[PDB]
Design a protein around this ligand. Structure first.
Ligand code: DG3
Ligand code: MG
Ligand code: MG
Ligand code: ZN
Lengths: 149, 230, 79, 249, 352, 119, 87, 77, 50, 201, 228
């Protein structure tokens, strides 16, 4: 029925046509299927999804940066993503992600100052999430102490 | 080099919009060389005139609706994009359109300015429903080339922001369609000699003949750079 | 190099040590303002250290030897 | 409309309710980009009340997903219509049929990896023809609250603000209808009472240098979110009963 | 204020600075890779095709995380350990993960594969350059049989490369692909009709003979040429491309009266639910294979082309067959459901 | 290999083995090397297979055991034993936000282990 | 700080007392009107530390000049607010 | 940090008589932010002298602003 | 207007899009004939026939 | 997580005898590919025992592997991670090539993580992958008859069968492995015969 | 019209045969417009000289084998296609090649001829195996343009065609390879702006630089018919 309708339009029964490349002007070496597809623009616009963050506000307890574009959030560096750095060598990239990029409060400001000073040096510290963990275990009535060198 | 130049032979003008142009004689392979090169300039580079800014009295933004008018302002603006205009002397002209009463507002209701020429006076712009309703607007037509969207134009100059100016897309490019066919020109001796048949389809403004002349001019201008500087 | 760091791995061997040694050298140029042995050619301190390692000018042992030399010259000056 | 449809297109457009449908029919007395008045036919027209149906059309309104809801009139002035005829098209409807998007001349063939894994290569002509250009109506609220320090003020008088910014705000501190705005522009000027600011010595020096003490007040103005840019179509003011109304309200 | 001088400074900072791209889920280490960024106007991240395999990235709306290695150490670990170029082989199995697919495979397949006579059968060329010039001039098909003179470079006992010149019986297309092929490799690599399976071997061979930088360049070249010729070809999908075997209805009516006879024998007494389930599944499973093999004979060849005089058989250039045989996308299993018989479907329990 | 980490021991050596303590294979081999050179009570051993979940909980790091699963139970058993985690593993170091003992960190980490010998 | 290992052990009643900086007697959180910490409540400044950096509760000592200066009147140490995450 | 560091350098850029007043009064290099009377009593200066040193100190800052004011003029939004 | 990839069809086994495309062109074919007859005015009788 | 390359060479002779996976006639996985990139041991020479062919500490490159195929070595003791003596990690030699690099593994590389990831990935990928992509199940159950592809002599290892009144050998063993030997005497095809089978020969 | 002209920027001459030419700045779409237009002229319109006809004594057809010669006549002809020739005055010259004895016959063995210049005298043509073997041929070089195959020459010209005259392909075009690449030229303001990279590969008779100049000249000569 579709081929019969095409013949009524004087269009090809194959519904393939000769096409010419706009750039070269030369023909494509075989017939191409051309016609009308009804297309939809979905709600997923890049405008709404594009997001980027260098430094921003930080979470209340854990001191890690917030999540989500509405809260101007850093992307979550998950277990899965950490393991990838473990498989590689990448130990400095991982420490970065754990410390000056997340909790380490003194570390992040100090390294920001170094990057504007053009030092590109880390100077790592202690992640505030761990300080909390300690306090949460002592709140359970378990003595958890750091034993020195 | 037994150099063999083509010359413009036949200009079938089927309509003011559509015009076929045969071209001969062409040496083998120059049919496609000139055919595509010209098609590309004729689509992307052709200079023309188009509506850039529209200011309607009693209208602050393009999303509002004016009473006594069937079409929302957006739909009116889209009709003004299709308004075919020639400016003779100046690069920028502001035309005034004041009309009232029941009727389809056409392009002829714009105050005919001396140098400016409206190619399609019957072009529909607005439908006025109630007789008491009157519409008044100032349509700015600028000359440029190619396609300049209002979104690309709302992130460049913007030296003055007069609350009242609406930016709408204006396809400067007069050329709507173009295709070239290489046919055999069974020449006196040569059978590989060919003709170039350019089917052009413009809106108003540019003359087919004049447009081809201009496009060939632009290409030859760009070659001066290579023939000259080594 | 510019594209790929395979040649510089072939000089030292351990990818991990390549990174330490290129880091140490890039730090010298970053902080100390040590002059580069190869023309800079608008290259970052990361890439210049890898060039120097590729051509075989920079190395853990060589860097240690010159550290001792500058350090002993400073001891000489203090005494 | 969809060129290749099924027939459910019309059913869905009508039953969704987003289209204005004629209950009574008759002849259209008056079209407008706002309203449709139909004069009803004597056969359905009851002899009690006046037999003129008025359908008011909903103009460019916000959806829950911040899309645009706009009704345009389908019929022309003086058109005869029956019961159950579509009088006005909703947002994604053609003359009565459901129109979710736009049909296009498509060719199946590779390009220079520009359609690699389902990636799509589109002509500039699509953008030019403003097909798949979409309208998003976003609703931003500015709330004046009462704090322990005192009530927040919605004045145009805002500490540390350029004349460029205050140009777009009117007497009350509200942006004008029709005004184009871009990220960081102030929409509704708001200031919050600050309790006694014990300053760092630097800030004491800095506030002394400009003399812009700017009273005991901060800047909490509602401003356009960063990178979103639009035209102000509408403004609404909700005030309490007791409190003296803004000039703009 | 986004001042014009700031763009120029930003361009200067990004130079030679690696950025980490991550896709969820990060299953294996290649789910993070480092790249040198290229500043682009527009809001979308542009990903290199060949690494789409490691990320399992397809561009129907997937997103990626970007992360900036700050320290000199982190920059170096990204450039040396985590760079795209340096992570070519899968750490899971020895094979290259960086492998052409889809358009690229189809294009190189289209170039290498041969046709009967076509334009300029049995010509003779001076090197791949005369061949390229002939094709682009329009005097030769990519599938023309011809004898070109290519000069391969074979490695000797030491590090020196030996040069060897000899006449080869291949096609225009394969000759032009030789131009991409680095020196060291044999011409026999391009002399077959290339599929994805052969191209993976090509890049592994090149990696073990020549080394990393050459394979990196060679990989990019393959991708560029593959897309480029894929587009020239204009290969597409019509409904007539899906060919149904003439002898489907016969196979099916035979299979169908047969299963009917076993269902009637079920009320009689030689059959449990399990026995008959197995017997019916066996009958339909063999019928499906039969109809599929009928479709694939009819489609794979069934090309009647007249060679320079009389008729010949050669492989079909039917679009879907080329897609399947090249391994560009669908497999014979998918094309069974398109053109042959869809087959026995299995319930959520797993029982069929 | 990680499954076959632990081993049960019969008899005593010069350390505290006695009947049927489960100790890691590496540590009992270390003991056996010094024992065979010096003598003392020889110790028969038998390698035990641990399947993944139990093998991960049998690790002599409680920070790794806790992070894995069963955290409440792990911390009670560690708290009662007065267990001391010297942080040899990767998970342990990632938790405290330190350099991994592997890849880039293996150089630095081995330098710290020799700093334990003096200064 | 840089440490070797970590140990875990049962907390002695007296061990628990060591970490403590006071006994919270009352459930009182903060004052409904002056949203500041109540006497010996759960957010007591006298126990956990000052709400604002280097500032006592009743406001007698301000600025970084006053360091560890426990205000006699309200009983609040003039140190950083950070302490209320650790005490 | 940038502001606090610049101030130290700004103190050793103008006069030692004015920088002394602002350092001790604001509590920059000093400790207790001495008000008008305390600063006057120290240097032995008078109430009018406080306004004279203040006006001279602002003129010195205007010089830094027309040189490096590229940052101060940006405080106007 | 749009160039879509052939290889995202036989793998996907949505052949509907191809039939939609063939019919879509046939639909537009007849629209292009009616557009041509309306541009040249012609007869109401002839339009009615077609 | 803990498993890291700690040492270069523990100096171990011990290894796990890896045979060629020849299941279902056509060799499923060759011995060459199974011992490619792996450190050999126990002075694995060629058939004729009178000269060493391969050392006890070397890297099996594609070149060594191609030599192995000309001589048709079937069985090779190679050094493995399991038999490595290194305490608190494993030796570069027991492991062999870093398959991602194409040369001997670097000391300090986190091997365990790579192992877990690489076992885990295919499962997780093949879950979503085969499922959304297929509709029906195209299984083939017709495992009735063993037909042999290449001529040879029937080799039955592990088999206890009884002769039935037909003349035919009806197998009554549970584990039964029919092999196809050539001339020289190598194993080339395998075929799991079941219980209750009628053998032709 | 805010006209935006390109200018010839960099001429990397890798060799006399191969030369890369970057070109900027070009407006959007002119990269392919100029790129292809020039590619077509440079392949099928570049005028040059090439061997059209070869007559060897003792050779009636190109499929035979001459004794004392390693290469079959076809292989010899294919080598004569690669022979680089400049004719100064005349449009057609017949060169004579007579040589004997054991050795690789080179292009220097052709009898000079005043106006004609052989660009590659070391070009291999024939290998002679036995010393008693002598080869003699008359090689006709015509000037033409583009690529004229022998199969396209027999279909058009059907005048004098006696047996013995060996017809071989005559690649008049001095241009052996040409390809153009459009790369983005991130321009002061425009990111739309592009550069054109033309890789040319000629044989040596004609200069890459001068060939490009010439192709553009022919293209601009065709635009003289469109008035302006
Ligand atoms: N973990 C996880 N990954 C997912 C999930 N859905 C998709 N992904 C990842 C892995 C597959 C990848 C793309 O998904 P698709 O469904 O497009 O599958 P595909 O493998 O690309 O196949 P196809 O050729 O049909 O597009 O995205 C999900 O639910 N969980
Ligand atoms: Mg998908
Ligand atoms: Mg997807
Ligand atoms: Zn107090």
């Amino acid at each position: 029925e579709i081929k019969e309708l095409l013949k009524l339009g004087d269009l090809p029964t194959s519904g393939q046509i000769r096409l010419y490349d706009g750039r070269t002007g030369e023909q494509f070496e075989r017939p191409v299927t051309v016609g009308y597809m009804y297309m939809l623009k979905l709600n997923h616009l890049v405008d709404d999804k594009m997001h980027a963050r260098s430094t921003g506000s930080y979470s209340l307890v854990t001191q890690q940066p917030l999540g989500g574009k509405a809260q101007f959030g850093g992307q979550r560096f998950g277990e899965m993503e950490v393991w990838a750095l473990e498989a590689y060598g990448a130990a400095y990239t991982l420490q970065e992600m754990l410390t000056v990029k997340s909790d380490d409060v003194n570390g992040r400001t100090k390294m920001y100052k170094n990057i504007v000073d053009g030092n590109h040096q880390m100077e790592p510290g202690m992640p505030e999430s761990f300080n909390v963990l300690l306090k949460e275990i002592r709140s359970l009535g378990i003595n958890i102490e750091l034993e020195d060198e | 080099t037994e150099f063999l130049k083509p010359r413009l032979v036949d200009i079938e003008q089927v309509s003011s919009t559509h015009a076929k142009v045969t071209l001969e004689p062409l040496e083998r392979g120059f049919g496609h060389t000139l055919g595509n090169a010209l098609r590309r300039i004729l689509l992307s580079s052709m200079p023309g005139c188009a509506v850039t800014e529209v200011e309607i009295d009693g209208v602050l933004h393009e999303y509002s609706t004016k009473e006594g008018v069937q079409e929302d302002i957006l739909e009116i603006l889209l009709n003004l994009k299709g308004l075919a205009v020639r400016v003779q002397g100046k690069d920028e002209v502001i035309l005034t359109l004041n009309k009232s009463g029941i009727g389809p507002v056409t392009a002829a209701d714009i105050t005919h300015d001396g140098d400016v020429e409206i190619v399609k006076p019957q072009h529909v712009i607005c439908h006025l429903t109630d007789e008491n309703a009157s519409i008044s607007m100032r349509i700015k037509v600028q000359r440029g080339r190619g396609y300049v969207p209002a979104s690309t134009r709302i992130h460049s100059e913007e030296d003055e922001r007069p609350i009242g100016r609406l930016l709408v897309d204006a396809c400067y490019s007069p050329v709507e369609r173009i295709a070239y066919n290489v046919e055999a020109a069974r020449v006196e001796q040569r059978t590989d000699l060919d003709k170039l048949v350019i089917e052009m389809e413009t809106n108003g403004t540019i003359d087919p003949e004049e447009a081809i002349r201009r496009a060939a001019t632009i290409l030859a201008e760009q070659l001066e750079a290579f023939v000259d500087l080594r | 190099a510019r594209v790929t760091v395979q040649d510089a791995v072939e000089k030292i061997g351990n990818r991990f040590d390549l990174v330490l040694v290129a880091a140490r050298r890039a730090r010298q140029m970053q902080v100390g303002g040590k002059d580069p042995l190869v023309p800079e050619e608008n290259d970052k301190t990361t890439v210049i250290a890898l060039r120097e390692i590729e051509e075989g000018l920079i190395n853990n042992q060589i860097l240690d030897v010159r550290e001792r030399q500058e350090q002993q010259e400073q001891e000489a000056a203090e005494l | 409309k969809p060129l290749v449809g099924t027939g459910m297109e019309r059913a869905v457009a009508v039953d969704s309710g987003v289209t204005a449908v004629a209950k009574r029919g008759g002849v259209v007395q008056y079209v407008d980009a706002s309203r449709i008045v139909i004069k009803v036919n004597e056969d359905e027209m009851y002899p009690g009340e006046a037999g003129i149906d008025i359908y008011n059309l909903t103009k460019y309104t916000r959806s829950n997903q911040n899309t645009c809801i706009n009704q345009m009139p389908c019929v022309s002035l003086g058109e005869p219509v029956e019961r159950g005829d579509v009088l006005a098209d909703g947002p994604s409807t053609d003359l009565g049929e459901l129109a979710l998007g736009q049909n296009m001349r498509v060719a199946f063939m590779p390009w220079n990896g520009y359609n690699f894994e389902d990636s799509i290569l589109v002509s500039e002509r699509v953008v030019q023809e403003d097909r798949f250009t979409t309208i998003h109506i976003q609703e931003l609220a500015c709330v004046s609250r009462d704090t322990k320090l005192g009530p927040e003020e919605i004045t145009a008088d805002i500490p540390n603000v350029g004349e460029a910014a205050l140009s777009k705000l009117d007497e009350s501190g509200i942006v004008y209808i029709g005004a184009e705005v871009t990220g960081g522009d102030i929409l509704v000027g708001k200031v919050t009472p600050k309790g006694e600011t014990q300053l760092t010595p630097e800030e004491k020096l800095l506030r002394a240098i400009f003399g812009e003490k700017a009273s005991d007040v901060k800047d909490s103005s509602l401003r356009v979110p960063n990178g979103v840019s639009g035209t102000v179509i509408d403004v609404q003011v909700f005030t309490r009963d007791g409190v003296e109304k803004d000039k703009r309200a | 204020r986004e001042e014009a001088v700031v763009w120029d400074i930003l361009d200067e900072v990004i130079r030679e600075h690696p950025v980490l791209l991550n896709r969820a889920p990060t299953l294996h280490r290649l789910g993070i890779q480092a790249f040198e960024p290229v500043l682009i106007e527009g809001k979308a991240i542009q990903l290199h095709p060949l690494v789409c395999a490691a990320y399992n990235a397809d561009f129907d709306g997937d997103q990626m995380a970007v992360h900036v290695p700050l320290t000199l150490e982190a920059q170096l670990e990204a450039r040396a350990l985590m760079m795209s170029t340096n992570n070519i082989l899968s750490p899971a199995n020895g094979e290259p993960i960086i492998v052409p697919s889809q358009d690229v495979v189809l294009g190189l397949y289209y170039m290498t594969r041969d046709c009967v006579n076509a334009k300029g059968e049995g010509m003779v060329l001076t090197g791949p350059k005369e061949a390229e010039r002939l094709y682009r001039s329009g005097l030769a098909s990519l599938h023309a049989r011809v004898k070109v003179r290519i000069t391969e470079y074979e490695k000797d006992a030491n590090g020196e490369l030996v040069a060897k010149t000899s006449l080869k019986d291949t096609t225009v297309g394969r000759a032009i692909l030789w131009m991409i092929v680095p020196k060291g490799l044999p011409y026999s690599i391009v002399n077959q009709a290339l599929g994805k399976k052969a191209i993976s071997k090509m890049l592994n061979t090149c990696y073990r003979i020549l080394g990393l930088k050459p394979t990196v360049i060679f990989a990019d070249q393959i991708m560029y040429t593959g897309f480029a010729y894929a587009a020239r070809s204009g290969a597409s999908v019509g409904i007539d491309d899906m060919v149904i075997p003439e002898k489907k209805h016969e196979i099916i009516s035979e299979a169908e009266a047969e299963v009917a006879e076993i269902q009637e024998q079920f009320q009689s007494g030689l059959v449990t639910a399990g026995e008959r389930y197995n017997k019916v599944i066996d009958i339909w499973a063999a019928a499906n294979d039969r109809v599929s093999k009928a479709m694939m004979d009819n489609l794979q060849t069934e090309t009647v082309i007249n060679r320079d005089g009389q008729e010949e058989k050669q492989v079909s250039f039917n679009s879907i067959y080329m897609m399947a045989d090249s391994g560009a996308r669908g497999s014979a299993a998918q094309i069974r459901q398109l053109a042959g018989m869809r087959g026995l479907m299995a319930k959520p329990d797993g029982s069929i | 290999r990680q499954m076959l980490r632990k081993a049960t021991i019969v008899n005593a050596g010069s350390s505290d083995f006695l009947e049927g303590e489960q100790v890691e294979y590496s540590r009992v081999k270390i003991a056996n090397r010094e024992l065979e050179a010096n003598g003392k009570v020889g110790a028969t051993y038998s390698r035990d297979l641990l399947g993944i979940t139990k093998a991960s909980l049998a690790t002599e790091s409680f920070i790794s055991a806790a992070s894995f699963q069963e955290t409440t139970r792990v911390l009670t058993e560690a708290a009662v034993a007065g267990k001391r985690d010297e942080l040899r593993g990767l998970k342990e170091n990632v938790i405290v936000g330190r350099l991994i003992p592997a890849g880039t960190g293996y150089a630095y980490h081995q330098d710290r282990m020799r700093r334990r010998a003096a200064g | 700080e840089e440490f070797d290992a970590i140990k875990i052990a049962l907390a002695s009643p007296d061990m628990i007392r060591s970490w403590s900086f006071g006994e919270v007697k009352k459930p009182e959180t903060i004052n409904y009107r002056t949203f500041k910490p109540e006497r010996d409540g759960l957010f007591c400044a006298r126990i956990f530390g000052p709400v604002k950096d280097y500032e006592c509760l009743c406001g007698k000592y301000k600025r970084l000049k006053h360091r560890g200066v426990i205000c006699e009147k309200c009983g609040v140490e003039v140190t950083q607010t950070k302490v209320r995450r650790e005490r | 940090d940038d502001m606090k560091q610049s101030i130290v350098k700004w103190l050793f850029e103008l006069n030692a008589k004015q920088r002394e007043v602002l350092a001790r009064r604001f509590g920059l290099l000093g400790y207790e932010a001495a008000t008008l009377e305390d600063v006057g009593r120290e240097i032995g200066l008078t109430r009018e002298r406080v306004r004279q040193i203040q006006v001279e100190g602002l003129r010195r800052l205007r010089e830094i602003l027309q040189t490096q004011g590229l940052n101060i003029e940006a405080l106007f939004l | 207007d749009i160039v879509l990839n052939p290889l995202g069809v036989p793998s996907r086994m949505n052949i509907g899009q191809i039939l939609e495309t063939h019919l879509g062109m046939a639909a537009k074919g007849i629209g292009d004939k009616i557009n041509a007859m309306l541009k040249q005015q012609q007869e109401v009788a002839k339009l009615r026939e077609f | 997580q803990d498993l890291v390359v700690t040492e270069d060479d523990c100096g171990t002779h011990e290894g796990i005898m890896m045979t060629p996976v020849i299941e279902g006639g056509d060799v499923k996985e060759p011995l060459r590919d199974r011992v490619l990139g792996r450190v050999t041991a126990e002075d694995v020479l060629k058939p004729g025992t009178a000269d060493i062919l391969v050392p006890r500490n070397t890297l099996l490159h594609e070149q060594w592997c191609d030599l192995l195929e000309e001589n048709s070595v079937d069985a090779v003791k190679v050094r493995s991670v399991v038999s490595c003596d290194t305490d608190f990690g494993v030796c570069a030699h027991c492991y062999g090539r870093d398959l991602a690099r194409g040369h001997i593994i670097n000391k300090g590389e986190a091997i365990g993580v790579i192992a877990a990831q690489s076992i885990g990935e295919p499962g997780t990928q093949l879950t979503m992958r085969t499922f959304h992509i297929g509709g029906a199940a195209s299984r083939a159950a017709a495992e009735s008859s063993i037909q042999v592809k290449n001529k040879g002599s029937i080799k039955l290892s592990n088999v206890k069968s009884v002769v039935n009144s037909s003349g035919k050998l009806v197998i009554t063993s549970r584990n039964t492995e029919l092999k196809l030997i050539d001339e020289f005497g190598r194993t080339k095809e395998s075929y799991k015969v079941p219980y209750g089978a009628v053998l032709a020969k």
